Every structure is written in structure tokens, then in C-alpha cells.
């Protein structure tokens, strides 16, 4: 029923407004002070409605003199009920004396008809003002109106942490308020006579006992509520999670044949509960909600069209949020509090309605965890997860550990729609330059993918006036259209670019798209992992893998090594010896000193042979890097993968040489060549260990990491700077 709550200059609120209340309104956030202040404001307003003496609230700033609390009630159902010719009770006529009479006698005969269109809504506004000298003022100077509003829209507050399970006062109050019987017609004497006749060895014995008890227990007479409570207790057969479930179920069941719509606030429903217990609680609430719904074909006795009461609950558990989003759907909303730069509570709505049914069905804990984050990094592949979640790398940057990295697709991004919740949850979308520009070998021209066209259309804004810093960007947009053909020349048979470096184009795209919270990496993640400055570390890691992982297959190492040395040549036939001697094994047994020396000599000879072969077969320190990058399922320069080149039929010599290298000395790396194998983590750990062994100070290691890895370190630094800039707001 309540549709608007407005607070001005009170506690931690400067000017806050809340509207659009659903049935299952949910509140999450990191600023618990704001939630506590909102609860205090609501309780203070409802206490002042009942004429109770309480301490006035404090002001946010002393440069003002007033504090306002405004409530709007949707008095539509009551207006329809009261103003009907079929209703002639005392209560209806009394209601049409303080709610809909003052605002109707001032109208005329042409607008009263227009107010009965069966599509309009009637609102009642009540404002409470607190002055500087602790004075309370109301917009309506009539206590009867306040009493009627209080008795028509009760407020119930439940605390789950500090709850007394032995007290059932809320249950009794809810039962007494939601009744349709007049208990005053029951004759006390008749009931006493009935009981006395029921239990008696002589007529008139229970009456004498009751009279004797009353003659000495003489106290104040029972009130009406006490009498109805006693009658309910004598009528029923019996007297943390169970209490709350009973409260909610009773509230839903009783509020079906009455025009009283309570509002219930629940604080932390998941205190001391198993996650399955919370899920079952939400599911039971949803089932009770759906049992009493009469929509379209669903009809019959026991099904009603009465509106349900509004429910507010604050939680810190993703399970309850997940269940609420999956089950209720259109009948729920999520509120986020946060803070401001100078310090002031905010209120924002987080999108929680998804059109796609698959997304709702496959909804899991990660999606709910995305809600409880202050910075989200969206990535597409599974290698970005392996890189950005490294424990050793995150140890040196205690600012990027506060972000959450999520694998998102185009449809997933569309369904989530992070743009709606932008000021509450900052985010960055990291993609590749392949999604925008596509290059071909046969026809030496670029092409623009539809995502680039959509971004250009979004950036191009019409129906606008002139701005100084607006035309230049548009010019760049035009330049992007000029990249429609963009004829370029490729050397080494479509393997490299003679000119037109993609770095400048990527930088310009990033500068343009920074307003849309997007970042386009120049190359793939593994492209940044292995580059010209990290090749020595990659070679050292390969050498360490050879030294450690490779073990003698035969249980006796000395005899096998001697036989293979006397059988195969140590220099010309080194490759067959390495293939037939050393194998990859999890266990690494320790051999004899002579055996260890022989194995070390063989490994050193193999390392020297492979180093000489790779340095001789390939020219400069630019083809080895490309060969390694293309071997681990990647692409470089021309945006062509190893598999794509075979389909396109180009660079036969390069592919043949790579295939020869794969079916030769580098045969132990074949399992790690596949994507999502685990080489990224091992390489990162080895590099971190080497650098922290070489350099002692915690700043020199970070500087060397930045030197070796410019791109990922730049991304991490930018994200950390953004988080630190917005740290004062998203922190409890």
C-alpha cells in the first residue's frame, strides 16, 4: 500500500526517496549504517503515528532547520470498498469521513466522474516535520486520520539474531488484528454455565470455585484483546526459522478476506541456518504465495485476487537472493545502499528481472555473488580466469584482490545488463581486437564486425546541439568508417604487417570506448604472457620442466642408462635416446650420484641441442616467439590461428616446421599445448619465485614484473587506481 518514502536531512540522509515497492523487496549492501538509519526512520514515523513519546532523530547538517519524513499510501481498494452502494456499515461511513470526504467536497460534477475510470489510483500523503528545537509538526492536524492510517497499514518488525523463541506476542497480535468476528456477543455467564455443567458431580460447583477464585484474585478487568486471545487459545489445540516461517505463512493466509495490508521488515533471516535451510524457507514462502493466487484459468474456492502485503528483508547470504530471484521473478526487486564521496547514504535499484529462461534456470552461486562486489571484471575465455586469479601474483597487489572476475558471454552480458547498476557496482569489460576488426589474406582489406557497428551507432548521437569537445570524437568515428576498406600490405605470406601497427588503432579505440567501460587488449592473454622480454624465463621454465619432471621409466636407472648410451649415439641420436629414456611422471625418485651425474649430462646435452636447433632454424627473436604463441593455440599480427591457417591454406613452410617441432624433441610439451591445461599457473609461479629470489625488495619485484609484463600489469594498475578512487564510497 505504501508507495513512497522520502527523508530529508535526517541521520545519514540528505534527500532520499524510495518508490516502486514490490511484494518481495530485498535490500543488500555494505553500508549497514544506512539500513539501520532507514529502520530507525520507519520505526520513529510509526511510533509518532500512534502518539508515543520518543526521542527525535538527529540532523545530518546543522546549517538547516527542518527534517522531513513523507509517506504516501495507495488508498485505492479502500476507496472502492467504501464508496459502493452495497456497503452501509458503520466502519465504511466512518472511513468516508477523514480520508475521502475533505478532498471530494471541493470538487465538482465533471471531475468526480473522471475519477471513477477504473484505471486511476488514489493517494494519501502524510508529512512529519522535526524542527531545530525538537518540535514535531504534521501536515494534517487531526489525530483521527493518523489513528485510522495506523490501524489500516500496520508495521511489523522482526529481528532474527536476538529473537526470543519463548515469546509469541507477534503471533497473537497478528491473529487479533486479522479477525472477522465480534467476540463481544459471547455471554460470560452462559459459557461458565456450560463449563460447569460439563464438569460437575453436583449442579453448581464450578461456578462456586470460579467465584471464590475471583473474590481474591480481584484485578483489572480483561481488555477486548485479552479476551479474544483467551478464546483463540481455548479454541486451538496447541501453543528461529520455524518462528519466522509461521509468521510469514500466517500473515499470508489471514490477509486474504480483509482490507488490511501490513508491512513486515525482517532483519537477517539466514542467521545460523544451513544454506539448504534458507533455500527451503524461500521455496516454502513462494509455494504459500502461489497457492492463494487466482489468475486467468486458475479459479475456484480458496483462490483470491486480494493484493499481497509488502515484505522487506535484509540479507548477507547469496543463497536467499538467488532463490528469491529464481522463484518470484517479476514480483521482486533488489536495493543497494552504498555511500557518496562526502559521505551520505544512497539508494539504487539493481536489475534482477531476466527475459531469458535459460539464464534463470542455470542461475547459480556465482551470479548471486556478483551482487556482493565492489568491482567486477568481465572476461570471455577461461585463460583470463586462470591469470587474474593467481595467488602469487595477487600477493603483490593488495588492491586487485578486492575485485571479482566473471566469465561472461554476449547474451550473458545482455541479460545481466551491468550498465543499469553503474554508480553502485563499477565494472570493466575486457575483450580482444578480433571482435571489432577482421583481416583476410586473399583480399588485403579489413572488415568491421557488427559489434563495432553497434558501438559506432551508440556513440553517434543525433538531435544534439554544438559542443566544443564533441566534434573531434565524431571525426574519429568517421575515421573508423574509413577503415571499412583500409587496404594494407602483409609480408612473409600473410604472417606479419609491413606497416599500420595495431597498437595505435587499439589505443584510439580504447580512448573512444573508455566512456562505455570497455578495454580491448592488443593481443591474447598468452600473447602478453610470452613476449620478447619473457623468452629467457620461458626457456628457463622449460629447462626446469626437463630437469625435474622427466624420470627414468625403467626401475633400474643405471643399467637402462648404460644400455641406451651403448645403443644410441650420444650426439647424433640424442633425440631417440631422450624419447626412449625420459618420461613424464608425477613421482621423481632420487638416483645414485653417478646416475644423477649421467642424467644431468644427458639433460644438459639435450638442452644445448634444442637451443641450438631453435636458434638456427628460426631467424631473429621474432619468429620463435610467434612459433611458440601459435603453438599454444593462439594468433599473432594477422589474427590467424594455427588451425585457421590450415583452413585458409597459407604459410605451408611455417606450418610444416611447427608440425615437425611438435613431433620431435618438444614432444613432452604436447599435453600443455592444449587450452585450459595449466601451463599459465606454473609459468607464473616459476617466474614469481625466480624474481623474488633474485630481487629482495617488494618494489623492485613489481618493477621487474611491469617490465616483463606491460599489458596485464597496466590493466591491474588501472583497475587498482579506479578501486582506490572509489574506495571511500563502497566501504562499510
Amino acid at each position: 500500500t505504501i508507495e513512497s518514502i522520502r527523508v530529508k536531512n535526517l541521520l545519514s540522509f540528505d534527500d532520499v526517496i524510495l518508490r516502486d515497492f514490490r511484494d518481495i523487496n530485498c535490500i543488500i549492501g555494505r553500508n549497514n549504517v544506512g539500513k539501520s538509519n532507514l529502520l530507525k526512520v520507519i520505526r520513529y514515523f510509526y511510533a509518532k503515528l500512534e502518539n508515543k513519546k520518543v526521542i527525535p532523530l538527529d540532523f545530518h547538517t546543522n546549517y538547516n532547520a527542518v527534517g522531513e519524513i513523507t509517506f504516501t499510501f495507495d488508498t485505492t481498494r479502500i476507496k472502492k470498498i467504501v464508496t459502493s452502494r452495497k456497503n452501509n456499515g458503520r466502519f465504511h461511513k466512518h472511513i468516508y469521513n477523514t480520508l475521502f470526504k475533505s478532498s471530494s467536497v471541493k470538487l465538482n460534477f465533471e471531475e468526480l466522474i473522471a475519477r471513477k475510470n477504473s484505471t486511476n489510483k488514489s493517494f494519501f500523503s502524510l508529512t512529519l516535520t522535526i524542527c531545530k528545537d525538537d518540535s514535531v509538526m504534521w501536515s494534517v492536524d487531526d489525530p483521527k486520520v493518523r489513528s485510522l492510517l495506523a490501524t489500516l497499514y500496520p508495521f511489523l518488525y522482526i529481528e532474527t539474531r536476538h529473537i526470543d523463541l519463548y515469546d509469541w506476542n507477534p503471533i497473537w497480535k497478528l491473529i487479533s488484528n486479522l479477525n472477522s468476528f465480534n467476540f463481544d456477543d459471547v455471554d460470560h455467564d452462559e459459557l461458565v454455565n456450560f463449563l460447569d455443567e460439563k464438569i460437575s458431580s453436583r449442579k453448581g460447583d464450578y461456578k462456586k470455585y470460579i467465584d471464590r477464585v475471583v473474590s481474591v484474585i480481584d484485578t483489572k478487568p480483561y481488555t477486548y484483546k485479552e479476551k479474544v486471545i483467551n478464546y483463540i487459545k481455548v479454541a486451538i489445540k496447541g501453543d528461529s526459522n520455524k518462528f519466522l516461517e509461521t509468521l510469514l505463512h500466517l500473515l499470508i493466509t489471514l490477509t486474504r478476506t480483509e482490507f488490511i495490508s501490513p508491512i513486515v521488515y525482517i532483519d537477517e533471516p539466514e542467521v545460523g541456518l544451513h544454506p539448504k535451510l534458507a533455500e527451503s524457507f524461500v521455496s516454502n514462502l513462494n509455494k504459500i504465495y502461489s497457492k492463494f493466487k487466482k489468475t486467468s484459468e486458475l479459479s475456484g474456492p480458496g483462490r483470491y485476487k486480494t493484493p499481497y502485503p509488502n515484505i522487506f528483508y535484509s540479507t548477507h547470504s547469496p543463497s536467499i537472493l538467488k532463490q528469491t530471484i529464481k522463484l518470484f521473478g517479476k514480483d521482486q526487486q533488489v536495493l543497494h545502499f552504498s555511500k557518496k564521496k562526502d559521505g551520505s547514504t544512497r539508494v539504487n535499484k539493481i536489475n534482477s528481472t531476466y527475459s531469458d529462461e535459460r539464464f534463470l534456470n542455470i542461475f547459480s552461486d556465482n551470479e548471486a555473488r556478483l551482487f556482493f562486489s565492489e568491482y567486477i571484471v568481465f572476461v570471455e575465455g577461461a585463460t583470463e580466469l586462470e591469470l587474474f586469479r593467481n595467488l602469487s601474483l595477487l600477493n603483490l597487489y593488495p588492491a586487485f584482490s578486492l575485485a571479482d572476475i566473471y566469465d561472461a558471454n554476449e547474451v550473458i552480458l545482455a541479460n545481466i545488463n551491468p550498465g543499469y547498476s553503474k554508480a553502485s557496482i563499477p565494472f570493466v569489460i575486457i575483450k580482444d581486437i578480433d571482435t571489432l576488426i577482421d583481416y583476410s589474406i586473399k583480399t588485403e582489406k579489413f572488415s568491421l564486425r557488427p559489434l563495432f557497428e553497434k558501438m559506432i551507432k551508440e556513440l553517434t548521437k543525433e538531435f544534439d546541439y554544438y559542443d566544443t569537445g564533441f566534434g573531434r570524437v565524431r571525426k574519429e568515428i568517421d575515421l573508423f568508417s574509413d577503415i571499412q576498406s583500409s587496404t594494407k600490405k602483409h609480408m612473409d605470406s600473410g604472417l606479419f604487417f609491413k606497416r599500420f601497427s595495431l597498437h595505435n588503432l587499439s589505443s584510439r579505440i580504447n580512448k573512444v570506448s573508455r566512456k562505455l567501460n570497455r578495454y580491448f587488449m592488443t593481443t591474447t592473454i598468452e600473447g602478453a604472457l610470452i613476449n620478447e622480454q619473457s623468452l629467457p624465463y620461458f626457456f628457463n621454465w622449460i629447462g626446469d620442466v626437463i630437469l625435474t619432471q622427466m624420470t627414468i621409466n625403467n626401475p633400474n636407472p643405471d643399467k637402462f642408462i648404460e644400455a641406451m648410451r651403448r645403443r644410441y649415439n650420444i650426439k647424433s641420436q640424442v633425440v631417440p635416446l631422450f624419447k626412449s629414456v625420459f618420461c613424464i611422471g608425477l613421482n621423481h625418485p632420487v638416483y645414485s650420484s653417478a646416475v644423477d651425474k649421467q642424467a644431468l649430462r644427458i639433460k644438459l646435452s639435450f638442452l644445448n641441442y634444442l637451443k641450438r636447433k631453435v636458434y638456427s632454424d628460426f631467424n631473429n627473436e621474432k619468429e620463435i616467439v610467434l612459433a611458440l604463441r601459435l603453438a599454444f593455440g593462439g594468433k599473432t599480427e594477422t589474427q590467424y590461428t594455427l588451425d585457421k591457417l590450415r583452413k585458409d591454406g597459407e604459410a605451408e613452410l611455417f606450418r610444416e616446421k611447427i608440425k615437425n617441432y611438435k613431433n620431435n624433441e618438444l614432444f613432452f610439451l604436447e599435453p600443455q599445448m592444449t587450452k585450459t591445461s595449466g601451463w599459465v599457473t606454473t609459468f607464473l609461479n616459476y617466474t614469481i619465485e625466480k624474481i623474488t629470489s633474485e630481487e629482495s625488495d617488494d618494489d623492485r619485484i613489481r618493477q621487474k614484473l611491469s617490465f616483463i609484463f606491460p599489458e596485464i600489469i597496466s590493466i591491474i594498475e588501472q583497475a587498482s587506481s579506479s578501486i582506490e578512487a572509489e574506495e571511500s564510497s563502497l566501504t562499510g
Binding site: 526517496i17 527542518v66 486520520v145 538531435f463 546541439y465
Partner: protein
């Protein structure tokens, strides 16, 4: 904030007055040769030269000094996040409306009050030797001696840049006093520049009585301000303020509505009708928008000419885009506060659609 001696050297005066500290010379005031006397009607606007030491000092004062001193929420003008719609919004809950105007708001601000108001935020010390104080040095860049009234001292000109912030800061105790007075009477008060709007939700004749205006005058007499009796308006159930109509009859807990009259939208409707009637752009930009390209600056550096059809077209597009932005602001205000009549919403939606279609047609005709 507390500005000290070092703050004025590295923030307030970085390169404009840096040579007057080592020389130990007092900072001069603004001479009569650095200002203009732009006149419009019965008003005088004091402009300042762009290439002057004081203009950059004014920019720095606005950006770093006159943006952190607290204000009062009753001021809806010259502040970050304020608007005229926010000045009219709180009064939708009232049944009686009253309007007041301050006479010569920027000319009645005594410089002593300005000096006292900024005193707590500037420490008491000496800037240039034992001859000039920091407060006086700062104030020398925000004041001008009016030659029209030689008897008067240094005043705050209307045409400067720091004037609105100083006016908001100085007119803070008056806002607090008026708000405290109105709170006890249950009257909603708002202020925009020097216009005060009062709303009463209860059924009473307080806003139509001489007692209210007498009390407001008595409160304003502390600082010497006055209100002109030629702009005194007090009505019930409806009020029009510069084309903004606020209507609320109300018996108990009723919410009013805000709309715009047809006279407010007359010019845009005339422009749309003329454009749809194929009237040439020559008679549209000079008769309705009133934008003219004078022969004194008709491409003073170019004799090529023959560019009127582009200048007029883009000026018309800018005018239509500005009006569309104004209507979009009104729609956003309605969305965020829900205090606009539905029929007016339909009318403005239709007008926006018509304006967008006309802009598209103009662009297509220009392309063809």
C-alpha cells in the same frame, strides 16, 4: 577548509601574482580600465577582461575555494545539482501559494558582511609584509568600486564570476531565520536567486495576510534587504510563475500537479508551424528565434560568402535541440518525482516526436 599563506601561493595565485610576493608589493585593486559597462535595460553589467590577472584568480577561487563552504538547502540556485524544477517541486503539497521578490539583491550586499562571512575560512595573518592581510588580498579580486555612486564603497558587481557563490554564502543566516520562522507556521519555503516561494497545505489565510509580509520584511531588515511591492502574488488552488502552473485544491493529504501553459510553448509551436508550412529559413531565424548575422561580422576574414543556408540551418538545429533538451529535462523530472499532469505528458511527447521528425527532415533536405 582553512586557506593559509602557502595556499594562496600554490593554488590561488600560481603565475598571476607570483611576482608580487618576492617584490613585497601590495596587490592592487581592479582599476576602471579593466572593466566594461555593458548595459541592458535599467541594469548595468560589469564585465572583466579575459587577459587579466584577476580572472584566473576568480576561476581558481570558484573551483577550489568557493565550492566547499556549506550552504542551506533552501537555496536552489547557483549550486551543484540545483534547478528551477527543484525550486517548484516542494510546493505541490500546498493549497495556498505566495511569492516574494528581493529588490536589488546584488547591489544591497554590504562588503563588510562578505568580509565577515569568509573570515572563519581564512586564517588571520599577513601576506605581503606587515602591510596587507590575506583576507584583504583575496577580497581585492572579488570587489569593484562603482563609479556611478562615488559615495558608496566597494560593491559586488553582477557580471563577475564569483558573485553567485558569494551571494549564496552571505545569504545563509537569512535563509536559516526564514526557514525557522516558517517551520513553526507549517509553511514550505524555497528560494531561487532572490525569489522566495511559500506554500501552505492547510486551509488558512495566513499567506494572504499583511502579517506574513511584515514578518518577512522585519527578518530581511537585519541585513538591509527590501522587497518590492510590485511583485507580490498570493493565490489559492492555482498559481502561475513565468508559465509554470502549479495546481492543488486539496482537502487532506492531496498532491498537486505542475504543468506549463500554452503561452510558454507559443514560440516553439509557431516555429514548428512555420517549418511545416515550408516557410524559408530567412524569415524563421529572424522573426521567431531572433538570431541575426550582422553585416559587421559576415565572414570578416572571408569574401567567399554564400554560407547563409548553412549558418541559419545549424542555428535552427541548435535551437530545436536545446528545446528538446529542455523538454527531456522536464520528462526526467516527472520520472524522478511524479508531479506532472498526464495530459501535459501526452502533449509534450507529441511535441517531442514532431520536433525530432522536423530535425530529421531538415537533415535529409540538407543532404539532398
Amino acid at each position: 577548509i582553512l586557506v593559509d599563506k602557502v595556499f594562496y601561493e600554490k593554488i590561488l595565485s600560481v603565475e598571476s601574482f607570483k611576482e608580487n610576493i618576492i617584490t613585497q608589493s601590495a596587490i592592487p585593486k581592479i582599476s576602471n580600465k579593466e572593466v566594461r559597462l555593458i548595459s541592458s535595460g535599467s541594469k548595468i553589467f560589469y564585465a572583466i577582461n579575459n587577459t587579466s590577472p584577476h580572472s584566473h584568480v576568480q576561476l581558481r577561487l570558484n573551483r577550489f575555494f568557493l565550492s566547499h563552504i556549506p550552504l542551506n538547502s533552501a537555496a536552489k540556485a547557483f549550486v551543484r545539482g540545483g534547478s528551477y524544477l527543484k525550486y517548484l517541486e516542494p510546493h505541490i503539497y500546498g493549497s495556498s501559494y505566495c511569492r516574494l521578490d528581493i529588490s536589488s539583491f546584488f547591489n544591497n550586499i554590504s562588503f563588510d558582511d562578505v568580509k565577515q562571512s569568509l573570515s572563519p575560512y581564512i586564517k588571520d595573518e599577513y601576506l605581503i609584509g606587515t602591510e596587507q592581510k590575506l583576507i584583504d588580498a583575496i577580497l581585492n579580486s572579488v570587489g569593484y568600486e562603482s563609479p556611478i555612486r562615488k559615495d558608496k564603497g566597494m560593491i559586488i558587481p553582477m557580471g563577475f564570476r564569483t558573485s553567485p557563490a558569494i551571494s549564496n554564502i552571505v545569504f545563509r543566516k537569512m535563509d536559516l531565520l526564514i526557514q525557522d520562522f516558517c517551520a513553526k507556521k507549517g509553511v514550505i519555503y524555497s528560494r531561487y536567486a532572490d525569489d522566495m516561494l511559500f506554500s501552505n497545505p492547510r486551509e488558512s489565510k495566513l499567506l494572504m495576510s499583511d502579517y506574513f509580509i511584515d514578518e518577512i520584511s522585519s527578518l530581511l531588515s537585519i541585513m538591509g534587504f527590501n522587497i518590492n511591492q510590485s511583485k507580490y502574488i498570493s493565490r489559492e488552488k492555482e498559481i502561475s510563475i513565468n508559465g509554470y502552473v502549479i495546481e492543488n485544491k486539496g482537502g487532506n493529504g492531496s498532491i498537486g500537479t505542475i504543468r506549463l501553459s500554452k503561452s510558454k510553448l507559443n514560440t516553439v509551436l509557431k516555429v514548428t508551424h512555420a517549418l511545416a508550412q515550408n516557410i524559408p529559413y530567412k524569415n524563421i531565424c529572424n522573426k521567431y528565434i531572433k538570431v541575426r548575422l550582422k553585416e559587421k561580422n559576415i565572414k570578416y576574414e572571408s569574401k567567399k560568402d554564400e554560407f547563409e543556408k548553412k549558418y541559419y540551418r545549424d542555428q535552427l538545429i541548435n535551437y530545436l535541440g536545446g528545446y528538446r533538451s529542455y523538454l527531456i529535462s522536464l520528462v526526467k523530472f516527472h520520472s524522478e518525482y511524479k508531479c506532472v499532469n498526464s495530459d501535459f505528458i501526452i502533449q509534450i511527447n507529441g511535441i517531442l516526436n514532431d520536433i525530432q521528425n522536423h530535425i530529421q527532415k531538415i537533415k535529409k533536405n540538407r543532404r539532398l
